[PDB]
Amino acid sequence: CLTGPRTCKDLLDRGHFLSGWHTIYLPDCRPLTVLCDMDTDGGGWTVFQRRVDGSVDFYRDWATYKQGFGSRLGEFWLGNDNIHALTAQGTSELRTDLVDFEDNYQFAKYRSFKVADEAEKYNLVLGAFVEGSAGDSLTFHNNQSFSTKDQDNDLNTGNCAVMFQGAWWYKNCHTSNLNGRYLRGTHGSFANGINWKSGKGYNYSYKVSEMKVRPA
Amino acid sequence: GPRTCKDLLDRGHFLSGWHTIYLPDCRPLTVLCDMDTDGGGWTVFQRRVDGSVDFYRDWATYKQGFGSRLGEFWLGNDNIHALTAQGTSELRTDLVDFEDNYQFAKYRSFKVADEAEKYNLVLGAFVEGSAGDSLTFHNNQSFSTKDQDNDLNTGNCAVMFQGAWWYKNCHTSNLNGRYLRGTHGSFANGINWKSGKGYNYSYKVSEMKVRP
Amino acid sequence: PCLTGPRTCKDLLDRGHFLSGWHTIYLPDCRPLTVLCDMDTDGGGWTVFQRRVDGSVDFYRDWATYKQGFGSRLGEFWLGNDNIHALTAQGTSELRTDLVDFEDNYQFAKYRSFKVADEAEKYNLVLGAFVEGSAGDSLTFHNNQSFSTKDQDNDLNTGNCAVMFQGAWWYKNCHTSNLNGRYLRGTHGSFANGINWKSGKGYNYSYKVSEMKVRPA
Numbered sequence: 001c002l003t004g005p006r007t008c009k010d011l012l013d014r015g016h017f018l019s020g021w022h023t024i025y026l027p028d029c030r031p032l033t034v035l036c037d038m039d040t041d042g043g044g045w046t047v048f049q050r051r052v053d054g055s056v057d058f059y060r061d062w063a064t065y066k067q068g069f070g071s072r073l074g075e076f077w078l079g080n081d082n083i084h085a086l087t088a089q090g091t092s093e094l095r096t097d098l099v100d101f102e103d104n105y106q107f108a109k110y111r112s113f114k115v116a117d118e119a120e121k122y123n124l125v126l127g128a129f130v131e132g133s134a135g136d137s138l139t140f141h142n143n144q145s146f147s148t149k150d151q152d153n154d155l156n157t158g159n160c161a162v163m164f165q166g167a168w169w170y171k172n173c174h175t176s177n178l179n180g181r182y183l184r185g186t187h188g189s190f191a192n193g194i195n196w197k198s199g200k201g202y203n204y205s206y207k208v209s210e211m212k213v214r215p216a
Numbered sequence: 217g218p219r220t221c222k223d224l225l226d227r228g229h230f231l232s233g234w235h236t237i238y239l240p241d242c243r244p245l246t247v248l249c250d251m252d253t254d255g256g257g258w259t260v261f262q263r264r265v266d267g268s269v270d271f272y273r274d275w276a277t278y279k280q281g282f283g284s285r286l287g288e289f290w291l292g293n294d295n296i297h298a299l300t301a302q303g304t305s306e307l308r309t310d311l312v313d314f315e316d317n318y319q320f321a322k323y324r325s326f327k328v329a330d331e332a333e334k335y336n337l338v339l340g341a342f343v344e345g346s347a348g349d350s351l352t353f354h355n356n357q358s359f360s361t362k363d364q365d366n367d368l369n370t371g372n373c374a375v376m377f378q379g380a381w382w383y384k385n386c387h388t389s390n391l392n393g394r395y396l397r398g399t400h401g402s403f404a405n406g407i408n409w410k411s412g413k414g415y416n417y418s419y420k421v422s423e424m425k426v427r428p
Numbered sequence: 429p430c431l432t433g434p435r436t437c438k439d440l441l442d443r444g445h446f447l448s449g450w451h452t453i454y455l456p457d458c459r460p461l462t463v464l465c466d467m468d469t470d471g472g473g474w475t476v477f478q479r480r481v482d483g484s485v486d487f488y489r490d491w492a493t494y495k496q497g498f499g500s501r502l503g504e505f506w507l508g509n510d511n512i513h514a515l516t517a518q519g520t521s522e523l524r525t526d527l528v529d530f531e532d533n534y535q536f537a538k539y540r541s542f543k544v545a546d547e548a549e550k551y552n553l554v555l556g557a558f559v560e561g562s563a564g565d566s567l568t569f570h571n572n573q574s575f576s577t578k579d580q581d582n583d584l585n586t587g588n589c590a591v592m593f594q595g596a597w598w599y600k601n602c603h604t605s606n607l608n609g610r611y612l613r614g615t616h617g618s619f620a621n622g623i624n625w626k627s628g629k630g631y632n633y634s635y636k637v638s639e640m641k642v643r644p645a
């Protein structure tokens with residue numbers, strides 16, 4: 001409803017100062033309950049990805065990544081249809097917040113972030129890297145289909161989602177793997193964790209990870 | 217508008233959480249929906265997770281419900297009846313020990329009568345379960361709180377085992393017992409499932425949930 | 429809609445919401461606000477305006493932030509001083525403090541009345557009789573005190589209490605309680621800069637859980 005809230009940004013302007021699950025209205029005016037981060041970097045971010053404790057299985061198939069999964073009480077992926085619905089007219093920016101197991105925070109911010117629809121297999125349109133202490137380990141994945149174990153759309157003679165137990169805009173294969181296994185800090189296994197290459201490397205799996213959008 | 221966690225899943229709520237539904241009498245009830253386990257679409261009426269909430273409670277409290285949407289809770293006997301009376305609901309219990317071993321038992325049908333009949337347990341055959349069958353034993357028995365004794369033992373099961381349950385003479389499951397945190401010396405007064413981890417082990421997590 | 433609907437967590441309990449959680453109530457001015465209702469503790473029906481539970485949220489914050497509120501419905505939060513005032517402006521609500529240590533010991537402390545003035549009077553605290561509580565009175569001490577943050581010193585100490593004790597509070601000179609202090613996780617060497625309650629576990633112990641909540645008497 002034109003005079004209803006359509007982003008976490010709106011809700012903030014309208015005086016909801018507490019982070020939490022609010023329902024918003026998408027461009028097409030269908031209602032959708034989302035998590036609003038009202039605290040970080042000015043606040044007003046819609047969170048589409050959350051990892052926090054390893055409670056939820058993220059090594060999932062296409063249908064599952066399509067529709068979303070997890071729990072409002074915990075970890076979740078908002079779902080690719082929704083993430084597209086939310087970024088349709090790409091004027092909204094991306095923030096990535098990582099917290100390690102000693103509670104050290106790092107992050108990264110992009111100017112624009114858009115995922116295409118299923119027809120173009122949730123393609124990643126990412127505008128410029130603006131800054132962040134995590135370094136830029138997403139640009140590398142610009143202009144690439146999203147792949148999962150049962151649907152391969154990567155640039156690797158093998159199946160990247162299996163080789164790195166995740167779901168992602170995989171090329172050959174990745175520099176970031178935020179949907180990887182919740183490995184809890186330093187791990188021997190190679191690059192199959194919640195990893196950000198310019199952050200804590202290919203052998204460290206963050207304690208917390210959030211991916212979130214706001215109109216620019 | 218929706219009448220079960222099952223409906224909500226059908227209409228495309230894929231994320232577990234607290235949604236409001238509509239009882240067949242029509243009072244709306246905000247319930248926890250487990251959209252993940254075993255196909256999803258389960259309404260959770262009991263959750264233990266961390267020992268934050270006191271479960272050694274009286275009749276009025278078990279009647280109306282207690283605890284926190286943020287944590288542990290009992291949905292309340294009136295609601296559990298409202299919720300399982302009309303049409304047939306299937307039970308299912310998920311159990312997690314402190315060494316993270318997942319377990320369950322699952323029943324064809326599960327119904328609790330109203331207060332007049334003491335929220336009596338009406339249970340169907342065991343479908344399957346790695347936790348074994350530690351509930352059929354309690355079928356056709358009244359509910360008992362500490363302050364109310366409907367148990368078929370001349371002592372007071374509820375107080376001997378500090379919980380609440382359709383206690384008989386007395387129990388082979390005690391999912392509303394004390395949050396004892398794994399192995400305990402004390403006898404059968406924990407979150408215990410006899411064919412599961414035994415009378416001397418209190419699970420880390422416990423959930424009781426229903427689906428059409 | 430402002431009239432038909434609920435105005436306190438007490439009403440909601442009366443209306444048959446038996447489960448603790450976030451419900452919307454209507455301020456005396458008709459503005460909707462989403463509050464946390466503790467339907468379980470001490471008869472139930474309490475509106476929670478402060479919660480600490482895991483150390484996930486930064487509480488060492490400025491005036492504007494304490495004014496408007498901050499944190500997460502999923503976790504820790506301060507409801508905001510304007511709201512806490514809005515809620516107690518009619519002067520007839522009981523205060524309850526629920527604390528839990530890292531041994532799972534539960535202590536509480538209760539007061540007959542609790543009111544914070546508006547911003548003009550710097551959220552001045554008006555507190556009534558200590559009714560009882562296993563945690564001891566560590567609040568009466570802070571009667572009649574303005575609320576202070578790091579960037580706005582309104583205390584009775586030639587120095588800055590919020591800085592020294594890394595929190596925010598009705599600091600006097602400075603405190604016997606510091607429930608908005610740093611989440612230090614049990615025993616700490618540093619002096620009185622934790623989630624501390626002096627008559628409770630002392631100046632060198634930071635509780636695992638803390639909640640401050642109100643209910644119409």
Ligand SMILES: *[C@@H]1O[C@H](CO[C@@H]2O[C@@H](C)[C@@H](O)[C@@H](O)[C@@H]2O)[C@@H](O[C@@H]2O[C@H](CO)[C@@H](O[C@@H]3O[C@H](CO[C@H]4O[C@H](CO)[C@@H](O)[C@H](O)[C@@H]4O)[C@@H](O)[C@H](O)[C@@H]3O)[C@H](O)[C@H]2NC(C)=O)[C@H](O)[C@H]1NC(C)=O
Pocket residue numbers: 552572574582
């Ligand atoms: C709350 O505390 C105040 C003082 O604290 C200030 O105000 C509060 C609300 C906050 O803003 C704080 O930050 C401030 O620091 C107490 O006020 C005092 O009360 C006592 C009585 O209990 C008064 O004592 C009287 O003194 C009078 C003397 O003449 C004049 O003195 C000064 C000038 O020197 C003048 O400001 C004052 O108003 C008098 O005109 C006299 O009437 C009589 O003999 C009596 O002894 C004292 O004056 C008050 N102080 C101030 C700063 O005005 C409140 O009592 C307390 N409230 C409660 C309920 O406890």
Ligand SMILES: CC(=O)N[C@H]1[C@@H](O)[C@H](O)[C@@H](CO)O[C@@H]1O
Pocket residue numbers: 059060061063064
């Ligand atoms: C873990 C996962 O994502 N797999 C699914 C579901 O999508 C599959 O269809 C099913 C196999 O028929 O397993 C599960 O039920």
Ligand SMILES: CC(=O)N[C@H]1[C@@H](O)[C@H](O)[C@@H](CO)O[C@@H]1O
Pocket residue numbers: 488489490493
């Ligand atoms: C809560 C609040 O308003 N304070 C902020 C910011 O303004 C501060 O500079 C910082 C202190 O280094 O804490 C925070 O980052």
Ligand SMILES: [Ca+2]
Pocket residue numbers: 152153154155156157158159160
């Ligand atoms: Ca391939």
Ligand SMILES: [Ca+2]
Pocket residue numbers: 365366367368369370371372
């Ligand atoms: Ca008896």
Ligand SMILES: [Ca+2]
Pocket residue numbers: 581582583584585586587588589
């Ligand atoms: Ca000062």
